[PDB]
Amino acid sequence: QISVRGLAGVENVTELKKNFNRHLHFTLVKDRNVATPRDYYFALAHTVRDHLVGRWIRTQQHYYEKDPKRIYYLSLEFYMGRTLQNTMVNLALENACDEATYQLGLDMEELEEIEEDAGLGNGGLGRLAACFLDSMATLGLAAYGYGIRYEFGIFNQKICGGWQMEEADDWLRYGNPWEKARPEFTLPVHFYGRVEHTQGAKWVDTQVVLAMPYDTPVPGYRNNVVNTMRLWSAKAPNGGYIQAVLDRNLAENISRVLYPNDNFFEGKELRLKQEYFVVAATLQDIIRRFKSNFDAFPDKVAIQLNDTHPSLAIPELMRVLVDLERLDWDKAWEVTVKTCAYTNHTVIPEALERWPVHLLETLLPRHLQIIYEINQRFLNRVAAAFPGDVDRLRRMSLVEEGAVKRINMAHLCIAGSHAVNGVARIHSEILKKTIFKDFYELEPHKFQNKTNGITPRRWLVLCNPGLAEIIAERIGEEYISDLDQLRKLLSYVDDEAFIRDVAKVKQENKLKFAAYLEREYKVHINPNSLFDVQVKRIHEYKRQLLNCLHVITLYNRIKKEPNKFVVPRTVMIGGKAAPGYHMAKMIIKLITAIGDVVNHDPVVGDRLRVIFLENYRVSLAEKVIPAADLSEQISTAGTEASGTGNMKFMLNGALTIGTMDGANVEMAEEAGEENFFIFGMRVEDVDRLDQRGYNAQEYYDRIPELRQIIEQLSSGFFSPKQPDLFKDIVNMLMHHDRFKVFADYEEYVKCQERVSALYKNPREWTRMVIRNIATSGKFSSDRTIAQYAREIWGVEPSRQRLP
Amino acid sequence: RKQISVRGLAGVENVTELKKNFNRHLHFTLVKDRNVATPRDYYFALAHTVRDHLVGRWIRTQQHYYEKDPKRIYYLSLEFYMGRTLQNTMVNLALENACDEATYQLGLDMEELEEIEEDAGLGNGGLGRLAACFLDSMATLGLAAYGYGIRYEFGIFNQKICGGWQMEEADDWLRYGNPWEKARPEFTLPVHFYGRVEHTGAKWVDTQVVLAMPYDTPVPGYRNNVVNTMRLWSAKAPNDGYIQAVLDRNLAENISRVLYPNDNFFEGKELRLKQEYFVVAATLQDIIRRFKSTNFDAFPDKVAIQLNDTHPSLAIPELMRVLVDLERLDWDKAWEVTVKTCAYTNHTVIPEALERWPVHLLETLLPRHLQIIYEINQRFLNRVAAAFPGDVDRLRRMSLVEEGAVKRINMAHLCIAGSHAVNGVARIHSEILKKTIFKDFYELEPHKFQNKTNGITPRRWLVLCNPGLAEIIAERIGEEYISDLDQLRKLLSYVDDEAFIRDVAKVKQENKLKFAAYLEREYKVHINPNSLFDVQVKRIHEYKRQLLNCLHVITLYNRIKKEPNKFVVPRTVMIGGKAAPGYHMAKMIIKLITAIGDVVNHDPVVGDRLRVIFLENYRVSLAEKVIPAADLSEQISTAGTEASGTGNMKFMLNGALTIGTMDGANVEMAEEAGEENFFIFGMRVEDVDRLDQRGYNAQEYYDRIPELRQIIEQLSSGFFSPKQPDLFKDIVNMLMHHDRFKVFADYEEYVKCQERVSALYKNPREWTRMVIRNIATSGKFSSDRTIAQYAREIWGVEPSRQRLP
């Protein structure tokens, strides 16, 4: 019962027990005779949830009266993970529930493993939305997350014979205690139809899909604040009879499943429908809440667009103000731009949403007309500021010409937003300098940086309570909602006990993850090895492939000199591949196949293990990240906007090996470059290399160890039953590699040698770790959010506790 | 008020605790307060408050069964027409007055709250309401009984009347979340479909799997502390491009999507067949699971499977399949267990009702079951052959296999062969089964054939829907009659009692004002409450003859027009019921009713003397409102078409006199009451099949009955559809030439009989005394008496109304 999980006071513990028993009986209709482990999880979940209620009501009532500006974070994704521990942490209930359950004869962490992940996003962008909700409640902001209640979230990944298999993430199977259906605020959303023009346009003859809101509570850190995440579910409105009833399914498919498209644009109509569906229901809801004139609307409303996915909020808001509220165009436009702000999360051109004009015409005719009008007026502005610059107009247009004419939704976002932010300092500079150069020159004021962050509740206190406690023993608990106070730990770098303690905590965390693997997959790793972890979505740009070349280097090095001591490593790679990304699925197969060889070679044994961590998701991040020694963050310079997994490893006691890319650059600046394992090409070096043309063959012909690996790849060493299985990886690396894996091979491998050298010295490893944890405070999402609040949304955060 | 004796004790301590928990639920369960709670939130808070009182009894009851290990009764039905649960739960736990006082003190009218609840309309009509009455009675009689069926997402369609026509809306009854169900996800089971048969014995492989997830609804008995279970299965795709595959989960899940609105009409849809196997497979796995908590010799001593019609007939081949292929019993042994476990209830004699699945469809969907059926059939027919040697035509007739262009399996024959007992649902029905419909089977196995006359629960169909009637009865004879309905016989000694006569007429009148306030409030339909309420509510079929009621209504109109100054007993004629969505004829009949109303209700000469009104969306909750308001119960099916009926019994119990034919359970109602107390007209069974032998000619009646000939000419000419004058050409043609149900044959006697109805209505003392003579003898038609018979005569269990601790 560590101090940071609070007090287990006698009375409180007794009332919790009574209440657990009450819910098990009345809510779950069980007694001890026939209660399932799931029943006990649900009994605890309800007990804890009861403690949210009064605060939820009191919070929402207090906003209605204080009438503060309201913040609407609009996102296609909210990667929330589990809720039970988080609620307990934020309500200071953890120790008192852990003791209630003990006394009832139960292991509460066993009960916590029963909870399904709320996996309603893909990775970085969606988890960022989740951390943001957390931080906004902690900083007392009148904030709402708005999104889709997908029936199926990010697919569960199963590894079968070394390959990714996808299964439906049926996360709602048993019922969700942490949502509250609000069918009373159900709203109609419109599709197809056509437009008539007269004292204005009227969108008629539409098909209707109902949007039914489900509310989830979002508790702040011990401040008695509970904000709301509102997620919309699709409902049909109210051959022959039977087929008609079954065809209700088609409309309800809109909220069925999360598109597992991570930083890649697919152009599916059903995707477009999802985007409009969230956008229309949400805006109606915002407008209903504002009327409780529209001059004051941007004074009472901020809409933040998480990437371009909710971009139709710009034309939807215009459509509502102009056709329904009957405002004049320019006043409606003025209101829209002051309301709306856009976050860009990637520079990768294949990520960019470019909707076919034909498709928008059919589904959202009135919106397509508004987009053209917006385009017309915006380009008139470009023409006036830069007269006769024809190619600029072409480049900046919301309309892209071609065989298939498209709308570029990023450009629409820029046009319709008073602020455009990137998500780390270098990424935001890249936008001004390159990607959005033209827009920046027209409207330099628009462009901002907001470096990403993570919540220190889920990402420290919850997942690594032991680290949290040894920090709190030295500096108290204030840091948990004011993470810059972590700097105080720098005064402890020569403290013998703190050094011992930091290493003991990592050891216990490593032991813990080892038992997890042993228990759930019958997979044993040795906890007396350096845990080398690369967890994140499988993409070429993230270069799991560069990591693979490293592992094979380590293996071939052992085979060359088998009697030479090497620092034993357990190299763990984890993450999901998009179901239509051939090359990414081939990378998963490669990792397991190296695994198949390295793990069964008797000359290696325990000196090196290579394991693919199945089903990487938020709850698994919570387990592996506190156990990591080395955080792999090796994207090609310029390709990773920010990254947030990087911040998580820093906060939790791993040292980072990485490029100067995304937020890695800021992490290294906070900790000191001396305390970081920076390697490889900078953005300038990649550009110089693109100016001369990248020739992977040059690296192959002069780097002996790289040539050996590639010939093992092509020849069948890592696939003896199917010797040509990796011909596509080899061909891509040698002739079509957008991300220049070979260009960073040498420096990466050398820098890995330094990591190992440092690990042979446990005291200096630990001191360096302390210098990293100590400087991670900047990567709190409370800092990120305060910045958004003060520089974009025009509100002031407060951590002041509610009555 | 209101707070009457039969509704129990509103105790101070109980009322204060109920109000506390209501407010707790409003806050913690519903996340509301008084400022913003909706009238629906208030329904939900009450529903949770009441539901809580079921839990101790439910856990205790099911634990009692596990310890005592009684024979378990599994009532298998594709339908359970349960209606609403909140009032029935309160009635059965003696909580109504306490909750009405609690909600009263909270500033809430409890009746207004009840009216928020959706019907659970998981049935069509008689068959499905019968299953619901039976679950009620089985819990009141302390049987260890489970009803097993499908949780359809969409029950029986909600009917809207638009332009005088039926329109069908999805019955999205789970919209706001169902508090009277408990998901039982640990008991999820896999059901297999398609695949093929392999041989090592036999083995069914390469199947597509659909998960069956159980939802349990509590079934409280009448003040005995017993709470039984209705377990309903929901379809769930298993968890093994990508986007289309996730969406294609919809296909499997469609199995539990929607109740087939076919009322006595076999349509032969593969989707229907999947529903039938879905329930059967999950249920049977569950039964076997619970039994093993393996010697199957005792299996029939611990399990009864009652088949509500043939819809769950696959229960026979499935039990064989599990016992032979999975449990490796030998075939003869498995058969003896099956037969001894199963019993079959037939609900109608109409040939189009009958399920005959094509062999091609069973082959593909259920290949092992078709083999097991052909093997079942072979040994049945070897027995038939050994009993009646040389009778080749009798082999053809009794075969499970029907020959033809399209080869089919007769599921009724399957049911007879595989059941130790086969029953009809009213005396005259069970005899028509032995003497004709299943004549050959009755000759082979006379021991098998029984009667079980239908019943209705007097909880929902008296105490719930007509508390005033239950109260004036209780004042005279006490409250024991609620679960021992034959005690209503004591009221016969009150047929001359002036205060009882007065009281019965007072309750009827009060129920009439009530129902007229309902039409005024919910629609804007005006009806005169000092008119005779003439009510025909039931599913719309040619065989019920809403059309013969129609000819009578027009006769009355035309009688008034001929003699406008002649007094006539004022009437509000009400017809209600749903048409099957592709039955063109039943839809046309609904339209004709509204059109007759459009003329009659608008003719200034008529006004309040005769109104013709179509009751929209007839369903269990409407029946509870209108049946207590009825003065005359129309039960006019053609002789030998209506197996039993149960609405008939409802009207009898609630104080309506009955005009009907000597068909189904009408025969027994007139015999319990005395036929002098019963408005009987028309052809008997003899007279129908007598008339089928000589050939029925409807033109012969028309040529001789001038008032009938004026009606038909109003129809054809367009008097009742001046805008579309030939709108009703189809109905005239059918009546003139293609009437299977002999509408003109009974018209003369029906109209005459109706004159006796009116003549008696003009004598309210004697109207009322006849009513008393009817309520007093309604006892036989309690489903308590029905279930007692099923238990002793079929299941081998003794019922008990002893109270559980």
Ligand SMILES: NC(=O)CN1C(=O)[C@@H](NC(=O)C2=CC3=C[C@H](Cl)SC3=N2)Cc2ccccc21
């Ligand atoms: N919301 C509805 O419209 C009505 N309703 C419920 O609210 C449902 N309560 C919840 O879901 C629920 C209460 C909560 C407190 C939280 Cl802090 S989170 C959360 N969720 C119970 C229920 C049971 C059966 C039918 C309906 C309902």
Ligand SMILES: NC(=O)CN1C(=O)[C@@H](NC(=O)C2=CC3=C[C@H](Cl)SC3=N2)Cc2ccccc21
């Ligand atoms: N479905 C489960 O296994 C767990 N679970 C529930 O069963 C749900 N209680 C009921 O449905 C429920 C309790 C009842 C008493 C009755 Cl007498 S009837 C009835 N029904 C509360 C809940 C809330 C949120 C998530 C899950 C759940």
Ligand SMILES: *Cc1c(COP(=O)(O)O)cnc(C)c1O
């Ligand atoms: C934080 C996180 C991410 C993002 O990690 P990156 O390394 O920045 O790509 C993706 N998935 C999960 C489950 C995470 O927790």
Ligand SMILES: *Cc1c(COP(=O)(O)O)cnc(C)c1O
């Ligand atoms: C009782 C009942 C029936 C059966 O009525 P019959 O007249 O016997 O066909 C049909 N529907 C409902 C709603 C009923 O309650």
